[PDB]
Write a protein that binds this ligand. Structure first.
Ligand SMILES: COC(=O)c1cc(O)c2cc(NC(=O)NCCCCNC(=N)NC/C=C/[C@H]3O[C@@H](n4cnc5c(N)ncnc54)[C@H](O)[C@@H]3O)ccc2c1
Ligand SMILES: COC(=O)c1cc(O)c2cc(NC(=O)NCCCCNC(=N)NC/C=C/[C@H]3O[C@@H](n4cnc5c(N)ncnc54)[C@H](O)[C@@H]3O)ccc2c1
Ligand SMILES: COC(=O)c1cc(O)c2cc(NC(=O)NCCCCNC(=N)NC/C=C/[C@H]3O[C@@H](n4cnc5c(N)ncnc54)[C@H](O)[C@@H]3O)ccc2c1
Ligand SMILES: COC(=O)c1cc(O)c2cc(NC(=O)NCCCCNC(=N)NC/C=C/[C@H]3O[C@@H](n4cnc5c(N)ncnc54)[C@H](O)[C@@H]3O)ccc2c1
Lengths: 342, 342, 343, 343
């Protein structure tokens, strides 16, 4: 299948094992911004659901399918590949909805659906939007979507902005300097210090921060889920030209995302921005190896290149320069192995 | 088709060795002064066990124990390591001018070939609750390279189990599970999953430390003598216990810690992870009962702790316990692979 | 087959009047200075409502309110009491040389005969949560003896409801019920009864006091006007509510208190059992939800509190509540007759 | 029936309602002395149960029946009159014992059993042993007992001893003196002071005490359950002659009880004595209206007369004198209305 071809088995096993835990479902469900917004998006756009056929991609415990049911869906196919599928079945029976919600265990790339659907619902967003590569499963599911069918969410906006955080930058060196000692219990560890620094710099930092560290208005990269193909997410090139609002050292780029549910009655937004209440997605920061000095009114230009890998994540390549001085910085980061700093 | 590969799922092995490939994890272990200092003291104070001897270091990581063996006058030390840390160990051996004495051999100790038999094996094979990671088996497997009358460091391991009362720990885990009691979470009845949620939460061993005043009886000790034991002995570990209750109250579960002893020619040195001793990176481990047992001071609490090895480099733990005077019984099944770090 | 006997099981009536027969219980009530002092102030400061008037004292107990009516210049006071306390009231009337003004009439006010109509009725008919004991109906029944211009003291009653958060109260009741979770209590599996145990514990309204900082929204008020109401109005009491949440958190249930007003010709005097006011022997009452509802500040929590009168001189309480924004719902059934005294 | 003839309906309703609550079962079950001793008595005398037919009188949740089952009983009839019967049925099913434990709802005086039993088990003891008059239901149940048959418990011993407790005595007057005031909000209450004192003195005091208040070795009254007839408990006369071990004022008599399970293998005792760990039976003290002065070596003689009433309790008459001085005291107490003093 399409899933198996783009995914290493060792990664898939661990991934679905993780999503098998009720504790993880509870964690997601307790995020009121997440759960409450999905409910509002679905219920306030009830005419998009009333007597319609629905597909729920990666349904977990089934919450979104129950929201679809509350909004009057005739039939809902809830697909889930983890062992959570069996717990969803239990809930469907206990809530007397066996006639309306049909749980289908398996990958959405592998299962068969009996009929085409009017609307697809899912929560395919990982850290930095793209992590987990579930957006591709969501897009793959459009083979089951009728012409003029809708998708919830309809679009996703990834936001990038440059930040200054001297303490975050310096912390990498302080940690690595453990190895810069000539007699640790009689052993000279200094030769490994450079390797430790490299290791810490490969890790994107998952944490939140005060918005006062942001040095320019964000640049937005939009994926329209109605129009996009799976293929569009294998190589994601995000050019940026930031107009600097403050002078100082730029230590890296900060990432967050919004999604929009574009219904017939209204558009509802779910934001993970640092200006908004914290979600279980937090925000993500990728450091530069060396900070770039910019003055207010300079432009900081470059590219963020995300290359999909077989571990259900991305290799991140960031190149940036201050156009006025020609000072340049790169970094290469492994999105699969983030540092949780919070 | 090696012994390691036969008892280990590939997905588990990949993740395991990836984890131990990170310098940050080496640093974490090395910064435990009780662990690093005690290993150094054990080796150096028993220098005649090392002077002009051949040594095998099983799972050497960064190589620290091999450097200690060298400081104590070892003629030759084979340092085996299966993670990518092997390459960093090589770097340190060169940078410390010890290429004549320390030979790094990358690979699993079950798979590599050594040119000669050794006088002594050194390792840190202990995981959480001693047994986790199933590295004790690799350590014992390595005895095929040990000369007759060869020694092992550590020489023996003692696991200790004792009943505890901790209402706050119990209520915390119970309170989390009770999230799934709600009849109307955004209009959805979750209560059918409540039993399954409780099972999941109570299946997790709790890794943290505690005041010794929670212990309700003198510990029971199970000893593994590394000189005598075979790999096979660790596939199924049955630990009988009969506790003489020193205090009345609710027993919420069993607490576990371990000591190891380095039995040298000059002296015996102990490394203890007991709650009476300074904290180590092993902490201590508590297995909760789903329902606490009431006992009076002077009652006996008897039963069995059964550890069954699995292919994820850990153990399924079965605990059966009863208050003999009343016949109040509790049985519980825990997944040592998925601990809760408090 | 009086009105009292028809609405009341004999076993409940026996126990009820036996309880109110004890001097120790009278002392308990009389020692509440807020209660005794406020009744005295209401009566004495409205002396022209009593001066040379005929008075009925419904459920007079030891007779204290009748003595207050006498101090305020009443010509004649009929003091009705169904418990054996009637005989102790007679003793006090003689010992205080008021035999010419206070006439004790033993029996239920639904059963006795009074020789004439009265200008004003006085009583303390309020139980826990106002309605408990169903004495408000005896008080209203007594209006058959009231002249057209006639007044009532108290004149009106306001019941207040507000949502509260109290994790410790919730966990306490839950922790007690969880005794019945054990799979091996001396070798016996009790877990099949766990649901029934929880129902039983959560069916009990909690009588005690609390800090007002647990209240999560402004109270909703339900008013009974004693001058206008009929006995029948109290058989089924429906209290709708729509709370505008002032704080985010888990709502563990609803808190209840009441005020009564003595609306006299000279002034109105209030007796409040609110948690903002000094403690009375009525305390306050909390009905827990079996499962708490999460609300955010600015949500609305709407539903109904339905009180259905029973033959045990109390009410079956039905509470249905939902957070409108999420549709999270809780319904609960409580036995007001069997409260848990937590103080 | 025999139960209905000796019991007022209003008393029976309230009584069985009380025992219907899981909270009350839990209270009793959590008494480790009670539950643990019953289990030990049954299990350590397993040959009295192995393949035998058993009757469990007033089984409540069924715990004693489950102990009988653990000891190898072939069949157990568990009789219970409260709504707890239905909860017991649930536990029998949940513990897969429907083939061995048969719950029979109703009064043991009214139900039918299909066959005679080898042994009766029960917990018929109330406060001071006799309260609740359940001992009579237990004895009544012997109509179902085979000739060889045993009873668990087999015998009950009530203990009486004189005590000195000045603070307990004085406390009655301090409480009553609330009424000894000439102007309580303008009302002279003093006429009721004597009546308040009388009321407090009619109540037996349920709490525990240090054994150092006891002024003489206890006197024992034994009921042998194998031999006694229901009738024997309608009028219980307990003569006493105490040989005073200490000088001082005797303020009343203290009561506790032991029961013995006399099995084939061993005798097991359950004691509620003040020398033993506290149980949910506590101990009971009946005050004298006036204390008696005695010197060490004097004899304090008299009678405790318990007269059964239709409220499932006893009217207690206590008469005592110091033989050397002829100083005499009486008291009359209502066992149905005890004062729970324990804090
Ligand atoms: C190498 O090791 C590491 O370095 C590692 C290892 C780890 O495990 C780590 C875990 C971390 N945890 C963490 O904080 N994550 C944040 C998540 C927040 C946002 N959550 C989501 N909304 N998730 C998306 C929803 C998914 C659902 O859809 C189902 N589904 C997926 N695909 C299919 C398909 N094809 N067909 C059918 N159903 C499918 C799936 O099963 C779920 O139910 C952090 C770091 C780690 C590092
Ligand atoms: C939420 O996420 C989870 O679910 C999760 C779950 C978890 O359990 C987690 C556990 C955590 N930490 C942890 O465990 N701390 C206690 C251990 C401290 C001390 N460790 C040891 N001394 N271990 C043994 C030494 C091994 C060395 O030997 C090498 N080696 C092994 N085998 C062989 C072989 N056959 N041949 C050759 N070399 C071999 C290996 O590469 C190493 O260098 C942290 C996070 C977790 C998260
Ligand atoms: C077993 O444990 C339980 O289950 C339980 C359950 C409980 O509820 C418990 C309640 C407790 N205490 C309590 O409630 N405290 C504060 C609230 C009381 C505030 N006092 C009042 N104002 N009440 C109303 C006034 C009545 C007077 O009027 C007389 N009267 C009534 N009706 C008529 C009639 N038709 N005709 C003529 N006279 C009548 C009556 O005889 C009195 O003299 C304590 C323990 C409990 C235990
Ligand atoms: C309003 O406040 C008050 O005025 C008040 C006044 C009070 O006195 C209070 C007393 C309190 N506590 C108390 O008493 N503690 C001492 C007793 C502890 C040990 N109890 C027993 N073992 N009881 C004997 C066994 C009974 C079981 O046998 C069943 N059963 C009985 N007869 C029959 C029959 N004929 N047929 C079939 N089944 C029958 C019955 O249903 C039960 O399951 C608490 C509160 C109070 C409040």
């Amino acid at each position: 299948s399409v899933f198996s071809e783009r995914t290493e088995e060792s990664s898939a096993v661990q991934y679905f094992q993780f999503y098998g835990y009720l504790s993880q479902q509870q964690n997601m469900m307790q995020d009121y911004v997440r759960t409450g917004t999905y409910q509002r998006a679905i219920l306030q756009n009830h005419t998009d659901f009333k007597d319609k056929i629905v597909l729920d991609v990666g349904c977990g415990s089934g919450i979104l399918s129950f929201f679809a049911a509350q909004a009057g869906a005739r039939k809902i196919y809830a697909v889930e590949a983890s062992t959570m599928a069996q717990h969803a079945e239990v809930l469907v029976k206990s809530n007397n909805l066996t006639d309306r919600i049909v749980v289908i265990p398996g990958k959405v790339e592998e299962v068969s659906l009996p009929e085409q659907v009017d609307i697809i619902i899912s929560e395919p967003m990982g850290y930095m939007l793209f992590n987990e590569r579930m957006l591709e499963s969501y897009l793959h599911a459009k083979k089951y979507l009728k012409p003029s069918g809708n998708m919830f969410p309809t679009i996703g906006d990834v936001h990038l902005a440059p930040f200054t955080d001297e303490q975050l930058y310096m912390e990498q060196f302080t940690k690595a300097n453990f190895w810069y000692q000539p007699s640790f219990h009689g052993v000279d560890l200094s030769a490994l210090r450079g390797a430790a620094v490299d290791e810490y710099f490969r890790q994107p930092v998952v944490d939140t921060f005060d918005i006062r560290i942001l040095m320019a208005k964000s640049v937005k990269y939009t994926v329209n889920f109605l129009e996009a193909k799976e293929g569009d997410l294998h190589r994601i090139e995000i050019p940026f030209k930031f107009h600097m609002l403050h002078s100082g050292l730029v230590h890296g780029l900060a990432f967050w995302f919004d999604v929009a549910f574009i219904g017939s009655i209204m558009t509802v937004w779910l934001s993970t921005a640092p200006t908004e209440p914290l979600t279980h997605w937090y925000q993500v920061r990728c450091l530069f190896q060396s900070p770039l000095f910019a003055k207010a009114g300079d432009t900081l230009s470059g590219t963020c290149l995300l290359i999909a890998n077989k571990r259900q994540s991305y290799d991140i390549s960031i190149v940036a320069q201050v156009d006025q001085t020609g000072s340049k910085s790169s970094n290469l980061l492994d999105l699969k192995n983030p540092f949780f700093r919070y």
